[PDB]
């Protein structure tokens, strides 16, 4: 069932996830095609938490490089609400699909990276982390406008509670995971997103994922295979006994030069890549620094890189709420879109 009538008709498949599906549809009010994401999260607490976070975040945000929510469709009562549909702008493709079919020139890479970082500056200024940046979540049109989508794994930043043990399970897409995820981090600091952006830049440079780990620890094998052995100083910052012991046990690995991996890339793009793909998250470049990097000099304009008016100042505290209370919160958050 894709129950979005009567305003939205002539449905066509786009993609799907574990508990949702996105289709294109014709909007019979504005006479334009739109994207509609059906979400069916109510049987699981975790899915309810993610759905609620995405809706709350996207409804507060207003930025050219971030997908918005134009409409939310759901039943008039909690009892009758089994699914929720989110209406968004329809784009033409995503960076994942684009990279299967063509090699991007440097000036397209530069302009796309600029937009990713512009959008990320706004997200981070709101004290929010995206936590699942990857090519399929970067939507594009023929005018080369780029929008960040899929905030289902987003969280309010919590650097004071980022610590976790060695080899702790993680939810976000493997290939875009920072090394610290596998060593000592829950992915609750802004630096997690900068690593993912670095991976995306590398992927735009060669049309191949830079660290295609086949399984959980293999992801760290791929990262260390290019960055080489971490310095003593970086090891001194590693926190966990088990993470330190693991890294000290490895044979010495020298770094693979970015210009040997990417022999046709712009030298300024590789300098910025090096700074985003820095092993130690405390030394990794921040979003505002990345925007100010010489690679992006032609687009850099802090006056035209807006920040959020209303950041999320507190944790949402959804972790111990039962799925029934979360359904009530999702119902209340979506009430503004009901007729009348
Ligand atoms: C033709 C085309 C359009 C789009 C596209 N336009 N607008 C969109 C909005 C969204 N939103 C969105 O939240 N997508 C992620 C998702 C989808 C389904 C299940 C779980 C997560 N996704 C794709 C799109 C993406 C790719 N090709």
Whole-number Å distance between alpha carbons of 21 and 40: 9
User: How far is C-alpha 280 from the chain's CA centre?
Assistant: 20
Torsion 250-255-260-261 (CA) sign: positive
SS3 38: strand
Helix (H) or strand (E) holding 3: none
SS3 75: coil
Residue 161 has, within 13 A of its CA and on its CB side, a CA count of: 5
Any binding-site annotation on 16?
yes
Whole-number Å distance between alpha carbons of 308 and 125: 6
SS3 19: coil
Q: Write the Ramachandran bin of 279: left for phi over 0, alpha for psi from -120 to 50, otherwise beta.
A: alpha
Does any ligand 1 atom lie closer than 6 A to the CB of residue 37? yes
Q: Could you give the C-alpha distances from 204 to 96, 107, 135, 200, 289, in angstroms and in order? A: 10, 11, 9, 6, 20
Whole-number Å distance between alpha carbons of 123 and 153: 13
Whole-number Å distance between alpha carbons of 139 and 338: 28
Whole-number Å distance between alpha carbons of 168 and 218: 14
Any binding-site annotation on 31?
no
Whole-number Å distance between alpha carbons of 35 and 179: 34
Q: Which residues in the chain have their C atom more than 2.5 Å from the N of the next written residue, marking a break after them?
A: none
Angle at alpha carbon of residue 243, lines to 238 and 248, rounded to 5°? 95
- Strands, E, within the chain: which ranges? 8-16, 20-27, 32-39, 71-73, 84-89, 93-94, 128-129, 138-140, 146-148, 155-156
- CB-CB contact of 89 with 66 (8 Å): no
Does any ligand 1 atom lie closer than 6 A to the CB of residue 92? yes
Angle at alpha carbon of residue 330, lines to 324 and 334, rounded to 5°? 150
- Strands, E, within 17-145: which ranges? 20-27, 32-39, 71-73, 84-89, 93-94, 128-129, 138-140
Among 13, 23, 35, the mutation site with the greatest number of ligand 1 atoms within 8 A of its Cβ is 35
Atom number of ligand 1 nearest to Cα 150? 13
Domain spans in the chain, listed from the N-terminal domain onward? 1-90+322-339, 91-321
- CB-CB contact of 328 with 74 (8 Å): no
Q: What is the DSSP letter of 256?
A: P
Whole-number Å distance between alpha carbons of 204 and 210: 10
Whole-number Å distance between alpha carbons of 32 and 113: 28
Whole-number Å distance between alpha carbons of 248 and 245: 5
Q: Which residues pair with 72 in a beta bridge?
A: 86
- CB-CB contact of 17 with 34 (8 Å): no
Does any ligand 1 atom lie closer than 6 A to the CB of residue 34? no
- What spacing in Å lies between the alpha carbon of 65 and ligand 1's midpoint? 14
Q: Counting runs of H as helices and runs of E as strands, what totals does the chain give? A: 12, 10
Question: Domain 91-321: which topology?
Answer: Transferase(Phosphotransferase); domain 1 (1.10.510)
Torsion 164-242-257-275 (CA) sign: positive
Resolution expressed in Å? 1.7
Catalytic residues: 132
Does any ligand 1 atom lie closer than 6 A to the CB of residue 198? no
Q: Write the Ramachandran bin of 187: left for phi over 0, alpha for psi from -120 to 50, otherwise beta.
A: left
- CB-CB contact of 52 with 301 (8 Å): no
Does any ligand 1 atom lie closer than 6 A to the CB of residue 20? yes
H-type alpha helices, 126-257: 179-183, 191-206, 216-227, 232-236, 241-249
Phi/psi at 139 (5° precision): -90, 140
Helix (H) or strand (E) holding 188: none
Whole-number Å distance between alpha carbons of 296 and 294: 5
Q: Which residues contact 175 (CB under 8 A, 6 or more apart)?
A: 134, 199, 209, 210, 211, 212, 213, 219
Whole-number Å distance between alpha carbons of 224 and 214: 15
Q: Which residues contact 311 (CB under 8 A, 6 or more apart)?
A: 125, 126, 127, 128
- What spacing in Å lies between the alpha carbon of 245 and ligand 1's midpoint? 42
Strands 32-39 and 128-129: unpaired
Question: Domain 1-90+322-339: which topology?
Answer: Phosphorylase Kinase; domain 1 (3.30.200)
Tally of CB atoms within 10 A around 261: 15
SS3 157: coil
């Amino acid at each position: 069932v894709f129950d979005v009538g009567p305003r939205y008709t002539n449905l066509s498949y786009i993609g799907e996830g574990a508990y949702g599906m996105v289709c294109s549809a014709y909007d019979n009010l504005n006479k334009v095609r739109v994207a509609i994401k059906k979400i069916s999260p109510f049987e699981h607490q975790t899915y309810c938490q993610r759905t609620l976070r995405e809706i709350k975040i996207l409804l507060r945000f207003r930025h050219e490089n971030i997908i918005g929510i134009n409409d939310i469709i759901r039943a008039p009562t909690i009892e009758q609400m089994k699914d929720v549909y989110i209406v968004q702008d329809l784009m033409e493709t995503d960076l994942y699909k684009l990279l299967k079919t063509q090699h991007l020139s440097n000036d397209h890479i530069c302009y796309f990276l600029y937009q990713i970082l512009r959008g990320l500056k706004y997200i981070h200024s709101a004290n929010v982390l995206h936590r699942d940046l990857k090519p399929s979540n970067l939507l594009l049109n023929t005018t080369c406008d780029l929008k960040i989508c899929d905030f289902g794994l987003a969280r309010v930043a919590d650097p004071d509670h980022d610590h976790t043990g060695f080899l702790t399970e993680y939810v976000a897409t493997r290939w875009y995971r920072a090394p610290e995820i596998m060593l000592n981090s829950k992915g609750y600091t802004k630096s997690i997103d900068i690593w993912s952006v670095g991976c995306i830049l590398a992927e735009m440079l060669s049309n191949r994922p830079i660290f295609p780990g086949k399984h959980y620890l293999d992801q760290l094998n791929h990262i260390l295979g290019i960055l080489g052995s971490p310095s003593q100083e970086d090891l001194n910052c590693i926190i966990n006994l088990k993470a330190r012991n693991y890294l000290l046990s490895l044979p010495h690995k020298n770094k693979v030069p970015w210009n040997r991996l990417f022999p046709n890339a712009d030298s300024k793009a590789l300098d910025l890549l090096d700074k985003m793909l820095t092993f130690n998250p405390h030394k990794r470049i921040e979003v505002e620094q990345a925007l100010a990097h010489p690679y992006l000099e032609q687009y850099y304009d802090p006056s035209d890189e807006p920040i959020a008016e209303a950041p999320f100042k507190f944790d949402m505290e959804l972790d111990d709420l039962p799925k029934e209370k979360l359904k009530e919160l999702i119902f209340e958050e979506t009430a503004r879109f009901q007729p009348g």
